[PDB]
Each structure stands twice: as structure tokens, then as C-alpha cells.
Design a protein around this ligand. Structure first.
Ligand code: MG
Ligand code: MG
Ligand code: MG
Ligand code: MG
Ligand code: MG
Ligand code: MG
Ligand code: MG
Ligand code: MG
Ligand code: MG
Lengths: 250, 249
């Protein structure tokens, strides 16, 4: 028994087990659902494109794991600033049956000086999600924002507009989660005092058990070792699962 | 008989389609531009639901908001899970579809189950009608094969409220044929629903000469003025280039 084994099981149970690939199929999503039911316990969720939600729901139900949440993505991956498009996609994700929607913040608009559109877009999408008892995560795309001031500002605006989680990255740009970006976002959660109502999700590039342990260590430091539960912490990852299971002897 | 006259008619009745594994926003934007042809606009585009919002914006910004947006649900499998089909249909409506082409559960019908097809079409029609969205039903004539089954699937779809019956998904070995088209249009005529139910051949219709044959069937069964945009569509992609070529473009 090691800290690495303990952190690896913890991380596994916080995973949004993800496939968001150009060649995704029903068959691949079904296999992903089976993978989410691991020999050491269930992941917290899967994360898939909206069109796969109904077959995923059926698959999770039929294998006896209806408690595995179905997350999806909207305004994705580009984070455009057209609220009508973001909201139409979010309403469709809800209609497909999403439990959680991860919407991309309009980060290029923010970089260009538009703080208002990011607030309005997140608020509109939160309104739809809240009306359906769906949790809203907001992807701010730290690898494109780059500057600590912009990462803090995007996080702050998303929280003020009602984000239930803030998420680092889409996984569809070159640069995704870093420990530095993660720490900045979690410091915003702490500084605003919203740790009871806002979770954190690093996504993209988290591939090994040692990586997961490093990201969890930041949460334990800033909030206490009990804070990072499924309502407050998720890993957006895929190949990470095999690394965690290997660390656990499976 | 004139191929230029039939080609201009067919162009204006096209649901210009892309339903491909490599579809992207860029490809759908290009399709929207293609639908605004130098001899007039197609009736609609037909795309996967996730591209509806960007297509609507693209069509509006080029001044052709009258080009309708059709999409597909329960597609292409035609499975018999009504909850899944209805969820996808409701999502298509929420994306902004003008029209939903749902796949009939034809494998269930081939196994002897007529009721699931009725209930599935009816459930999707109820959602669409409440949203002022038109429902087409794909019966997959190339998998049904037998004339009696093609007639039965058409009849069930019409009785459950289809606004259009459509031959095919474009995703199986056999799609539209003139024989299947005639059988389906005969059902429309025989049930007396030619005022409320249109017909759409889809899949494999690639040449102006083929388009001419399908319109000739409609003209024979219903008269030459029946096939307008509310009662006739072509489900096709590369057909548009063949029609434009026949028209000198
Ligand atoms: Mg793709
Ligand atoms: Mg398939
Ligand atoms: Mg197992
Ligand atoms: Mg997209
Ligand atoms: Mg709140
Ligand atoms: Mg610092
Ligand atoms: Mg793109
Ligand atoms: Mg599908
Ligand atoms: Mg079934």
C-alpha cells in the first residue's frame, strides 16, 4: 500500500472517461462504457459527443452502472462567441439526455477584450442546464489564454455566470492542462470562496498515475484532503485509466 | 421529354446532402454555399444534427434563409428503441431542424413487428408537429426488398403521420430504385394521401438522367404539377453537379 496506489484509485473514481475523436462510433462508445466499469470501481462519468448519449445511457443501464454520469461537450472545440449556437447545442445535449455539459468559454472574445459575452454565454447555458438538473462545466482553454491574468479572469467570469465546474482544456488544441494552470484556476476557486459550489477538472495530457497524483496534490493542499470528491474534482482523460489500473495491480 | 427542364425541376427539389464520416463545419458551410446555385436555390440541405446551428447561420448570412434544414435521426440503423429515436428527434428539434428524416424500424418489421414502427413514427411525429417540424420516414427499401414489405412500411408510416416517405438512408447496399419509388408512390395514391404525404428518393441518385426517371413516375401517378417542394425531394449530393452540367454550368 502506497500513496501512489491510494491516489490512483481516487483518481480513477474521479475520471470523466473520455472519447472525443473524429472516428468515434457507437461501437467505440459502447466499449468505453464497458471500460468505465472497472474491476476496482466505476469512474465518475464518461465524456462523449452528444449524439452518442442515448446509446451510452442504454449501455450503462444494461451493465448495471446507471450511476455513471454522462458528460458531453458544447460550443466545442472552438469556443466561438455566438450565444445562439452555444445555447442550441446545449439544449440539444440536454434533449439527448446529458447529465453534464462541458461548454467552451468564448476565450478568443475575452482575449480581444469582451468580458461580457463570456458571462452571457455561460449564463445562458447554465440557465438551460439548471432547468434540466444538468451540471455545467466551463472549459476556459488555458493553453490558448496563456497569461495568468486571463486564466484568472476567464475562471472568475465563468464562476460569476454560474459554472458548476471550471475545466482547463478541450484536448483539441496543442497545449492543455499544466500543473501551473491548474493551480491558478484552483486559486480562483479558493480566492472567490466558492469551493463548496465549484469543482475543478484538468483535461488533456493527463496520462500517467504520477500525473494524476500531482494534480490531486494541488487540490489537497489548497482545500484539504477531503475536498476532491466527484462533485468537486474530475479528470478529463482517456489513456490515464490503463495507467491507474496498472498502478493498482490490474 | 427534355433533360434541361427536368434537371431544373429536380435541382429546386433537392435536399442537398452530406452525411459522411469526415463531415466538418467547413464541409457543411461549403454545402450551404453550393445550395445557392447559379440557377436557383435547392429546397433544403440535409446534414447531421450537430451541424444545424452553423448551417442556419451560413444560410442566413448568404441571404437564403428559405433553404430548409433537414436532418436524420434513428440513423442509419433504424433500431427499434423508441426512447432513443425520440431523444435524437427532440435533440434535432432543439438544434433547430426544419425537417427530421427518421429511419423506420425496418428490421423489426421484417421480423413481424408492425406495431413498433407505428409507435416510433407516431412518437417522432408528435414531437415534430408540436415544433412545426416536418417528419420524413426512411423505410429502407433496399433492405425490405419485397414489394409487400415496402408497401406495408409505407402504409404504417403514413398511418402514423409521416409527412414524407423516403426510400433509403444512402448507407446500405441498395438505395433508391425506380421500382421502389413507384411502389411507394402507388401507396400514397392508393391511400388517397397525395395532398399530405410527399415522396423522397434518396441514395444512389447521381445523374440528371436518373432524376428525370423519378420525376416521370411522379408525373404519371399524380399529374405533372404534383411534385413541388412540399411533396417531392431528391436526397442526393453529387447529383447537383450533374444537374448543373445538364443546364450548362
Ligand atoms: Mg468527425
Ligand atoms: Mg453503425
Ligand atoms: Mg469488471
Ligand atoms: Mg462542431
Ligand atoms: Mg450558483
Ligand atoms: Mg502564483
Ligand atoms: Mg473546427
Ligand atoms: Mg448514430
Ligand atoms: Mg431493440
Amino acid at each position: 500500500m502506497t500513496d501512489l496506489k491510494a491516489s490512483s484509485l481516487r483518481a480513477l473514481k474521479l475520471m470523466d472517461l473520455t472519447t472525443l475523436k473524429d472516428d468515434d462510433t457507437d461501437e467505440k462508445v459502447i466499449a468505453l462504457c464497458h471500460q468505465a466499469k472497472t474491476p476496482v470501481g466505476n469512474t465518475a462519468a464518461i465524456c462523449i459527443y452528444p449524439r452518442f448519449i442515448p446509446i451510452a445511457r442504454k449501455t450503462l443501464k444494461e451493465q448495471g452502472t446507471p450511476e455513471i454520469r454522462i458528460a458531453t461537450v458544447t460550443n466545442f472545440p472552438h469556443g466561438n462567441d455566438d450565444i445562439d449556437i452555444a445555447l442550441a447545442e446545449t439544449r440539444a445535449a440536454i434533449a439527448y439526455g446529458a447529465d453534464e455539459v462541458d461548454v467552451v468559454f468564448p476565450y478568443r472574445a475575452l482575449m480581444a477584450g469582451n468580458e461580457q459575452v463570456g458571462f452571457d454565454l455561460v449564463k445562458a447555458c447554465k440557465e438551460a442546464c439548471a432547468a434540466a438538473n444538468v451540471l455545467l462545466k466551463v472549459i476556459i482553454e488555458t493553453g490558448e489564454l496563456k497569461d495568468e491574468a486571463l486564466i484568472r479572469k476567464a475562471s472568475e467570469i465563468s464562476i460569476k455566470a454560474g459554472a458548476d465546474f471550471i475545466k482547463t482544456s478541450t484536448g483539441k488544441v496543442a497545449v492543455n492542462a499544466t500543473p501551473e494552470s491548474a493551480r491558478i484556476m484552483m486559486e480562483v476557486i479558493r480566492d472567490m470562496g466558492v469551493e463548496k459550489t465549484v469543482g475543478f477538472k484538468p483535461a488533456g495530457g493527463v496520462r500517467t498515475a504520477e500525473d494524476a497524483q500531482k494534480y490531486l496534490a494541488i487540490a489537497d493542499e489548497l482545500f484539504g484532503a477531503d475536498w476532491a470528491d466527484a462533485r468537486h474534482y474530475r479528470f478529463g482523460a482517456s489513456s490515464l485509466l490503463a495507467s491507474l489500473l496498472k498502478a493498482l495491480g490490474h
